[PDB]
Write an enzyme that holds these catalytic residues in place. Structure first.
Site, PDB file in Angstrom:
ATOM      1  N   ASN A  46      24.642  -8.265 -35.398  1.00  0.00           N
ATOM      2  CA  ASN A  46      24.070  -6.936 -35.463  1.00  0.00           C
ATOM      3  C   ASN A  46      22.691  -7.018 -36.063  1.00  0.00           C
ATOM      4  OD1 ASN A  46      26.498  -5.746 -34.569  1.00  0.00           O
ATOM      5  ND2 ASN A  46      27.310  -5.994 -36.597  1.00  0.00           N
ATOM      6  N   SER A  50      24.881  -8.382 -40.042  1.00  0.00           N
ATOM      7  CA  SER A  50      26.295  -8.531 -39.952  1.00  0.00           C
ATOM      8  C   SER A  50      26.625  -9.012 -38.560  1.00  0.00           C
ATOM      9  CB  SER A  50      26.995  -7.224 -40.263  1.00  0.00           C
ATOM     10  OG  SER A  50      26.679  -6.240 -39.308  1.00  0.00           O
ATOM     11  N   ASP A  52      29.854  -9.003 -35.560  1.00  0.00           N
ATOM     12  CA  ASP A  52      31.065  -8.396 -35.051  1.00  0.00           C
ATOM     13  C   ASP A  52      31.920  -9.509 -34.486  1.00  0.00           C
ATOM     14  OD1 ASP A  52      29.724  -5.860 -35.277  1.00  0.00           O
ATOM     15  OD2 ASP A  52      28.545  -6.648 -33.594  1.00  0.00           O
ATOM     16  N   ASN A  59      33.206  -5.612 -37.539  1.00  0.00           N
ATOM     17  CA  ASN A  59      31.988  -6.090 -38.131  1.00  0.00           C
ATOM     18  C   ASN A  59      32.211  -6.544 -39.547  1.00  0.00           C
ATOM     19  OD1 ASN A  59      30.952  -4.161 -40.230  1.00  0.00           O
ATOM     20  ND2 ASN A  59      31.336  -2.744 -38.592  1.00  0.00           N
ATOM     21  N   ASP A 101      40.362   5.476 -40.957  1.00  0.00           N
ATOM     22  CA  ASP A 101      39.462   5.724 -42.065  1.00  0.00           C
ATOM     23  C   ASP A 101      38.750   7.050 -41.929  1.00  0.00           C
ATOM     24  OD1 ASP A 101      37.272   5.568 -40.373  1.00  0.00           O
ATOM     25  OD2 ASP A 101      36.512   3.707 -41.230  1.00  0.00           O
TER      26      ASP A 101
HETATM   27  C1  LIG Z   1      34.727  -1.263 -35.997  1.00  0.00           C
HETATM   28  C2  LIG Z   1      33.511  -2.119 -35.751  1.00  0.00           C
HETATM   29  O1  LIG Z   1      33.252  -2.994 -36.474  1.00  0.00           O
HETATM   30  N1  LIG Z   1      32.707  -1.776 -34.642  1.00  0.00           N
HETATM   31  C3  LIG Z   1      31.527  -2.514 -34.342  1.00  0.00           C
HETATM   32  C4  LIG Z   1      30.333  -1.700 -34.796  1.00  0.00           C
HETATM   33  O2  LIG Z   1      30.351  -1.629 -36.168  1.00  0.00           O
HETATM   34  C5  LIG Z   1      29.069  -2.361 -34.292  1.00  0.00           C
HETATM   35  O3  LIG Z   1      28.042  -1.464 -34.544  1.00  0.00           O
HETATM   36  C6  LIG Z   1      27.099  -1.935 -35.445  1.00  0.00           C
HETATM   37  O4  LIG Z   1      27.668  -1.990 -36.713  1.00  0.00           O
HETATM   38  C7  LIG Z   1      26.732  -2.483 -37.625  1.00  0.00           C
HETATM   39  C8  LIG Z   1      27.427  -2.656 -38.963  1.00  0.00           C
HETATM   40  O5  LIG Z   1      27.943  -1.420 -39.373  1.00  0.00           O
HETATM   41  C9  LIG Z   1      25.626  -1.458 -37.757  1.00  0.00           C
HETATM   42  O6  LIG Z   1      24.698  -1.929 -38.689  1.00  0.00           O
HETATM   43  C10 LIG Z   1      24.916  -1.302 -36.436  1.00  0.00           C
HETATM   44  O7  LIG Z   1      23.956  -0.282 -36.480  1.00  0.00           O
HETATM   45  C11 LIG Z   1      25.957  -0.942 -35.413  1.00  0.00           C
HETATM   46  N2  LIG Z   1      25.321  -1.029 -34.128  1.00  0.00           N
HETATM   47  C12 LIG Z   1      25.311   0.108 -33.274  1.00  0.00           C
HETATM   48  C13 LIG Z   1      24.619  -0.012 -31.929  1.00  0.00           C
HETATM   49  O8  LIG Z   1      25.832   1.102 -33.641  1.00  0.00           O
HETATM   50  C14 LIG Z   1      29.187  -2.538 -32.805  1.00  0.00           C
HETATM   51  C15 LIG Z   1      27.957  -3.293 -32.341  1.00  0.00           C
HETATM   52  O9  LIG Z   1      28.065  -3.433 -30.943  1.00  0.00           O
HETATM   53  O10 LIG Z   1      30.290  -3.294 -32.503  1.00  0.00           O
HETATM   54  C16 LIG Z   1      31.499  -2.736 -32.837  1.00  0.00           C
HETATM   55  O11 LIG Z   1      31.697  -1.496 -32.183  1.00  0.00           O
HETATM   56 NA    NA Z   2      30.249  -4.102 -30.312  1.00  0.00          NA
END
Ligand SMILES: CC(=O)N[C@@H]1[C@@H](O)[C@H](O[C@@H]2O[C@H](CO)[C@@H](O)[C@H](O)[C@H]2NC(C)=O)[C@@H](CO)O[C@@H]1O
Ligand code: NA
Ligand SMILES: [Cl-]
Ligand SMILES: [Cl-]
Ligand SMILES: [Cl-]
Ligand SMILES: [Cl-]
Ligand SMILES: [Cl-]
Ligand code: NA
Length: 129
Positions: A46, A50, A52, A59, A101
């Site tokens: 990300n 972080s 994922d 994440n 949550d």
């Molecule tokens: C439940 C989970 O972990 N979902 C992932 C998202 O969290 C990811 O989104 C990204 O998360 C990071 C850490 O919180 C954020 O900093 C970042 O902005 C966010 N990215 C977006 C585009 O929202 C996501 C990334 O593809 O992947 C899972 O959905």
């Molecule tokens: Na994702």
């Protein structure tokens, strides 16, 4: 492991995700499809540094510890590598915490953008469950 759609549906059903917090199984399968293409080994970094992990792209900012996301939480109390297992238990159990949550499945960006409001039942169509 790259799951088949129905294989994953069945695994998710066995792990109690069907209608978990009101999210029918297809939601979870849809989310996994678009998060990871059903690949338990999927990782994506990300913008915040972080990563994922796993089939549901959980994440490390919040949910797991990967040792390289400073200032992050580990709310699922797991190494992020546990989320890459061919055994989806750790991912499911963490996903259950996430979806519980308060934000539901909106935590999964791909779910919000690609599954939410769609006919997610299509994702379990034809599966023996
Ligand atoms: C439940 C989970 O972990 N979902 C992932 C998202 O969290 C990811 O989104 C990204 O998360 C990071 C850490 O919180 C954020 O900093 C970042 O902005 C966010 N990215 C977006 C585009 O929202 C996501 C990334 O593809 O992947 C899972 O959905
Ligand atoms: Na994702
Ligand atoms: Cl597929
Ligand atoms: Cl469904
Ligand atoms: Cl860390
Ligand atoms: Cl499993
Ligand atoms: Cl909800
Ligand atoms: Na973390």
């Amino acid at each position: 492991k790259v799951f088949g759609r129905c294989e994953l549906a069945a695994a998710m059903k066995r792990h109690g995700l069907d209608n978990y917090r009101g999210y029918s199984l297809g939601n979870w399968v849809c989310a996994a499809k678009f998060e990871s293409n059903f690949n338990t080994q999927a990782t994506n970094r990300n913008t915040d540094g972080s990563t994922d992990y796993g089939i549901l792209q959980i994440n490390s900012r919040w949910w797991c510890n990967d040792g390289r996301t400073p200032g992050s939480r580990n709310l699922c109390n797991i190494p992020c590598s546990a989320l890459l297992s061919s055994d989806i238990t750790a991912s499911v159990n963490c996903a259950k915490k996430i979806v519980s949550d308060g934000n539901g499945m909106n935590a999964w960006v791909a779910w919000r953008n690609r599954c939410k409001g769609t006919d997610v039942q299509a994702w379990i169509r034809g599966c023996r469950l």
